[PDB]
């Protein structure tokens, strides 16, 4: 805290509680007692605990009928009107699309739909598999996660 | 019909004005005006101008009769105080309060 190290008033004689700094955390405009610093909140997850938790999540998506497998899922032009019409064709509202290898038309077409995320088989994460209601995987991608999960 | 007149930020303590306001509470305006004329207090000059303004407000804005008005309510509230500094001996400083008041006079024929 900006200021001086000067003792505000002498130790004895003035009939007032003793002070040693204007910066003390007791005083108005003083320092914070346990002031914070930038910290790293990252944790460690073992490799076998991360892969064991994706297998647990994937098995629940098939038990709860939240996993959909097709062989092909793409659109013909990079138009958002095409994908929204295509998902209306399958009664899919809030969906996660996992593909074998991402084609650019499907990535541009879903950038503006805030309830659709389009991902490739490598970039899946545990939270989005739980956050979205339905998951749509091309079977290009279903076999790619099997070797990923041994 | 009840009619109000106020003097806000009047320069005198509220305890000094309350002595004069207790003289005319419940009186007729005929009788409250001569009690204030022969009271030798600085607060009796402040209270009489708020009482004369409440009579003119009742006659002009409300069409009332001076003959039948009475002082039904009168009360003095405290206002903001001004903080001054007074030097004492041996370099000590005192704080002087210059107290103000809010005088409220209420007249009505009922």
């Amino acid at each position: 805290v900006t200021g001086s190290g000067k003792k505000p008033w002498r130790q004895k004689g003035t009939g007032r509680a003793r002070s040693g700094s204007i910066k003390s955390p007791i005083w108005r405009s003083g320092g914070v007692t346990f002031a914070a610093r930038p910290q790293d909140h990252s944790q460690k997850v073992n490799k076998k605990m991360y892969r064991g938790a994706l297998k647990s999540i994937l098995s629940e998506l098939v038990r709860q009928d939240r996993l959909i497998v097709v062989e092909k899922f793409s659109v013909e032009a990079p138009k958002t009107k095409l994908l929204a019409q295509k998902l209306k064709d399958m009664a899919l509202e809030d969906v996660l699309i996992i593909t074998g290898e991402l084609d650019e038309n499907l990535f541009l077409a879903a950038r503006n739909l805030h309830k659709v995320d389009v991902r490739d088989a490598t970039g899946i994460d545990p939270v989005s598999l739980i956050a979205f209601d339905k998951v749509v995987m091309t079977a290009d991608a279903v076999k790619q996660v099997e070797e990923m999960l041994a | 019909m009840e009619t109000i007149a106020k003097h806000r930020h009047a320069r005198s303590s509220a305890q000094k004005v309350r002595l004069v306001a207790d003289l005319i509470r419940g009186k007729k305006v005929s009788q409250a005006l001569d009690i204030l004329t022969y009271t030798n207090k600085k607060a009796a000059v402040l209270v009489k101008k708020v009482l004369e303004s409440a009579i003119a407000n009742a006659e002009h804005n409300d069409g009332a009769d001076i003959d039948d008005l009475k002082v039904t309510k009168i009360f003095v509230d405290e206002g903001p105080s001004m903080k001054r500094i007074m030097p004492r001996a041996k370099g000590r400083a005192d704080r002087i309060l210059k107290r103000t008041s809010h005088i409220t006079v209420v007249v009505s024929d009922r």
Binding site: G13, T14 | K90, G91, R92
Partner: peptide
């Protein structure tokens, strides 16, 4: 400010040696 002089004064203060 400085203290009260009677609290400084040796005769008044140091009354019980």
């Amino acid at each position: 400010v400085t203290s009260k002089w009677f609290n400084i004064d040796n005769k008044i203060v140091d009354h019980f040696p």
